[PDB]
Design a binder for this molecule. Structure first.
Ligand code: MET
Ligand code: MET
Ligand code: MET
Ligand code: MET
Ligand code: NA
Ligand code: NA
Ligand code: NA
Ligand code: NA
Ligand code: NA
Ligand code: NA
Ligand code: NA
Ligand code: NA
Ligand SMILES: [Zn+2]
Length: 866
């Protein structure tokens, strides 16, 4: 399988303007008739090259003439000797029931549904399956009325009828030209939740949420979130919905999260279905985020789309930025920013240091479904946020407005978006564009000097990005480096130089530079890289007291959290080294006291307190090290938890009890209190065993909501408490029929610290709630083992690797996209010690030799083994 290169992009030889699709729908054999209106742009002797995968070609006509000048080749139908303008008609057959990869047209339970992004439409018919070809679609669907009473596609119903032998049909038209990745089709029998939204200018929108029969009780929050999304995009970005109907279909079988098909979004049911006894507060907030994300794509992705797949971040970085802003505006901005930083520093930094490292606009792709990444998405959004930092909200919105004014109705590039921002704002983003083309995480080193004679504070800042496997050359970036200086009372020192105010966003644009601030009347305590103002590793020599001071005084909630993270880092590193020497945990009393003070501070927002009291995950801990020791990290995190539970036992219990809430409500203040209460419970679980067991069991049995029940269950598992087996069996007996709820239970099984976790995990491959046919189940049991239980995944006997090899041997043939998700932990081998690395390499070499190795795995394996 051959790599494609961004620099090889060229305008298409042919365009398709209009396409009329007919589906004679049947699970075993679907017949597709596609009538396309084509126009030649290239040379008169150029053939039309159509993409197609696993199609049975029945016929080819050009202006109703059965065509002879064509041939099929690998992945293609090549049609020669064409007029300049013509009607192409293809008839072909496909088999949705055989489609286990869930790309193209497939089955989800008894429903038929599609997933076309990135290159799935070519599994449906022979087409120009590239996103710079935009066409107006009309779609006729013919099916058995009893089995498929709802027949849905993009847009509005323009025709409908009934036929003999129990068949019926519906035809749909969507007036907006679209790339085929935005096509969708759904057929099935559903319950439907119906509502309305009226846009600010008065357009009335019918809202329709399709769910499996029996699930209406879990649909209102998603509907509410849709309306919230639509209102917010009007208030924040001045954007209204542009169609008459907004359909969302929740399907149980779906490889990713959800999909922005124009007017007909298709969602993994995990990001739709919630009731207070099935879904946690975090599930509610994730539903909100994802519903919003896909809605936001209506402008950032659909009204302006991507010229080619290398420009993916153009829609994904920007839409992720939008979802974050939506979440942050509606909820706790601090808690949002904190969690997005945790993901950046703990998961995305890992990718940027891996063999799969790529810039946010990639240069080289073998399998495009491998580039829906933390980098494209999350780092992408950090790049959009840097623009926002450099421009300010008002100029950023001017840029958005110019972007849509120039590019509405077309397929644009990352560079087009940057130019709109630069042109609208008059901020020069020439150097800034390097963030699109350079991979790896920059390291920003800061030295400081205070001159008591002149009352000047000097920062010397340097940057470099280490080489990555994809790029041997690196150059300095335009890094917006936000600072704040604090005096001995915790007041902000005005930034100024030579009698003039100085912006607190420093432009760090060279390998090394100095910044001098005047009238610095007291030796400052700096807050550096405020709000994580650029996606960089910060190297500054902090004292413990500078950090504890920030925890007490910093103006931005994020800064308080971040200071706590830097304080902990030092002692995580210390204790990993101690673990390797066989020694007990060591922690200065003044560090425990800083956390004691957070617990007792009444003026701190509980949302913030909770995050300060949530230790870095094992992923975030791993980023602190060059060579990862996954067993030390896991054991250190547990030991640190136990030490704090002991030292802060009284305070923990007091705050746990103070934050009790007898009413459950899905409201942000109430969520914050619960997160604080449950952060306390996590420590309490690891305290004295009998008190722990009682507290955890009681919370699980008395819980009136899944947030509180799961927090208790999860603590019973993490601390291996006596009640654990009974509680886990109770959850299974109650919830086994509900796959989404059992996903949480599979995650706890997968991530259990028990000595025999892998034996238990293999046993669960036969559990009544598990199936290898369902991506969510795979991810919750197998994925979570490999990716979130590094101590067990990286067991010294290599048993973790062998397990994953066996699962991937199945998944490579069944569902290569889920396979490629699950292989990611093996491709990190060079971060591990020699002996682990050798076993991981042997596992990768076994997978490299699979018969019919998928392109998805091949890409990753070849990079990892280089
Ligand atoms: C490759 S699956 C499609 C992902 C979808 N565009 C999203 O943003 O969630
Ligand atoms: C944080 S300002 C102090 C910088 C340095 N320790 C000095 O004494 O100049
Ligand atoms: C929402 S999980 C079920 C929890 C319930 N308190 C029980 O003991 O069964
Ligand atoms: C993670 S709970 C421990 C496993 C449990 N005893 C079981 O067999 O399912
Ligand atoms: Na047709
Ligand atoms: Na077109
Ligand atoms: Na209104
Ligand atoms: Na907010
Ligand atoms: Na968190
Ligand atoms: Na000095
Ligand atoms: Na440091
Ligand atoms: Na099963
Ligand atoms: Zn998206």
């Amino acid at each position: 399988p051959q790599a494609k290169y961004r620099h090889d992009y060229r305008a298409p030889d042919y365009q398709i303007t209009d396409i009329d699709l007919t589906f004679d729908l049947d699970a075993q054999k679907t017949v597709v008739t596609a009538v396309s209106q084509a126009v030649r742009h290239g040379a008169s002797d150029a053939p039309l090259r159509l993409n197609g995968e696993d199609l049975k070609l029945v016929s080819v006509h050009i202006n109703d003439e059965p065509w002879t000048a064509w041939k099929e080749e690998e992945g293609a139908l090549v049609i020669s000797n064409l007029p300049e303008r013509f009607t192409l008609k293809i008839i072909n057959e496909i088999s949705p029931a055989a489609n286990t990869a869930l790309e193209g047209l497939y089955q989800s339970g008894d429903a038929l549904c599609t997933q076309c992004e990135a290159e799935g439409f070519r599994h449906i018919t022979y087409y120009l399956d590239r996103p710079d070809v935009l066409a107006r679609f009309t779609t006729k669907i013919i099916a058995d009325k009893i089995k498929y009473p709802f027949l849905l596609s993009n847009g509005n119903r323009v025709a409908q009828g009934e036929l003999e032998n129990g068949r019926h049909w519906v035809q749909w038209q969507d007036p907006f030209p679209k790339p085929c990745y935005l096509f969708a089709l759904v057929a099935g029998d559903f319950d439907v939740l119906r509502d309305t939204f009226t846009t600010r200018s008065g357009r009335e929108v019918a809202l329709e949420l399709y769910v499996d029969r029996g699930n209406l009780d879990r649909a209102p929050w998603a509907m509410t979130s849709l309306k919230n999304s639509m209102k917010w995009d009007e208030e924040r970005f001045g954007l209204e919905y542009d169609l008459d109907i907004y359909m969302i279909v929740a399907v149980d079988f779906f490889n990713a999260g959800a999909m922005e098909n124009k007017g007909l979004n298709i969602f993994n049911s995990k990001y739709v279905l919630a009731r207070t006894d099935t879904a946690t507060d975090k599930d509610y907030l994730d539903i909100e985020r994802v519903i919003g994300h896909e809605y936001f794509h209506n402008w950032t992705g659909n009204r302006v789309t991507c010229r080619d797949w290398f420009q993916l971040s153009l829609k994904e970085g920007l839409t992720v930025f939008r979802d974050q802003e939506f979440s942050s505006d509606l909820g706790s901005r601090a808690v949002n920013r904190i969690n997005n930083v945790r993901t950046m520093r703990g998961l995305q930094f890992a990718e940027d240091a891996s063999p799969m490292a790529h810039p946010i606009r990639p240069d080289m792709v073998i399998e495009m479904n491998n580039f829906y990444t933390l980098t494209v998405y999350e780092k992408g959004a950090e790049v959009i946020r840097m623009i926002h930092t450099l421009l300010g909200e008002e100029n950023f919105q001017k840029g958005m407005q110019l972007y849509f004014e120039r590019h509405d109705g077309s397929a644009a590039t990352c560079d087009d978006f940057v130019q709109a921002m630069e042109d609208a704002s008059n901020v020069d983003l020439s150097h800034f564009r390097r963030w699109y083309s350079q991979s790896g995480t920059p390291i920003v080193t800061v030295k400081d000097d205070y001159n008591p004679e002149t009352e000047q504070y000097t920062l010397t800042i340097s940057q470099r990005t280490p080489a990555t496997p994809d790029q041997a050359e690196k150059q300095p970036l335009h890094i917006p480096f936000a600072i704040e200086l604090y005096d001995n009372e915790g007041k902000v020192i005005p930034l100024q130089k030579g009698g003039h105010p100085v912006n607190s966003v420093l432009n760090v644009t060279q390998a090394e530079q100095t910044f001098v601030f005047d009238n610095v009347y007291f030796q400052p305590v700096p807050a550096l890289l405020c709000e994580f103002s650029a996606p960089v590793k910060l190297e500054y020599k902090w004292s413990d007291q500078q950090l504890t001071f920030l925890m007490r005084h910093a103006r931005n909630d994020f800064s308080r959290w971040d200071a706590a993270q830097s304080l902990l880092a030092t002692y995580i590193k210390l204790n990993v080294a101690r673990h390797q020497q066989g020694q007990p945990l060591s922690l200065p009393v003044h560090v425990a006291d800083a956390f004691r003070a957070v617990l007792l501070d009444e003026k701190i927002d509980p949302a913030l307190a909770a995050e300060i009291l949530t230790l870095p995950s094992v992923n975030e801990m791993a980023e602190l090290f060059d060579i990862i020791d996954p067993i030390a990290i896991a054991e250190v995190r547990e030991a640190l938890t136990r030490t704090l539970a002991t030292e802060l036992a009284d305070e923990l219990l007091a705050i746990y009890n103070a934050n009790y809430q007898s009413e459950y409500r899905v409201e942000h203040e109430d969520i914050a209190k619960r997160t604080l209460r449950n952060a306390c419970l996590r420590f309490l679980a690891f305290g004295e065993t009998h008190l722990a067991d009682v507290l955890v069991s009681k919370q699980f049995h008395e819980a009136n909501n899944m947030t509180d029940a799961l927090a208790a269950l999860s603590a019973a598992v993490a601390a291996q408490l006596p009640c654990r087996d009974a509680l886990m069996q109770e959850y299974d007996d109650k919830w086994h029929q509900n796959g989404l709820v059992m996903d949480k239970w599979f995650i706890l099984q997968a991530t259990s610290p028990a000595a025999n976790v892998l034996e238990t995990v293999r046993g669960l491959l036969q559990h009544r709630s598990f199936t290898m046919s369902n991506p969510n189940r795979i991810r919750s049991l197998i994925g979570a083992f490999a990716g979130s239980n590094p101590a067990a995944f990286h067991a010294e006997d290599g048993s973790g690797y062998l397990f994953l090899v066996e699962m991937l041997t199945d998944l490579n043939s069944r569902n290569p996209q889920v396979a490629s998700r699950l292989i990611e932990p093996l491709i990190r081998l060079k971060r591990y010690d020699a002996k682990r690395q050798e076993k991981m390499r042997a596992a990768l070499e076994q997978l490299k030799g699979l018969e019919n190795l998928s392109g998805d795995l091949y890409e990753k394996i070849t990079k990892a083994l280089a």
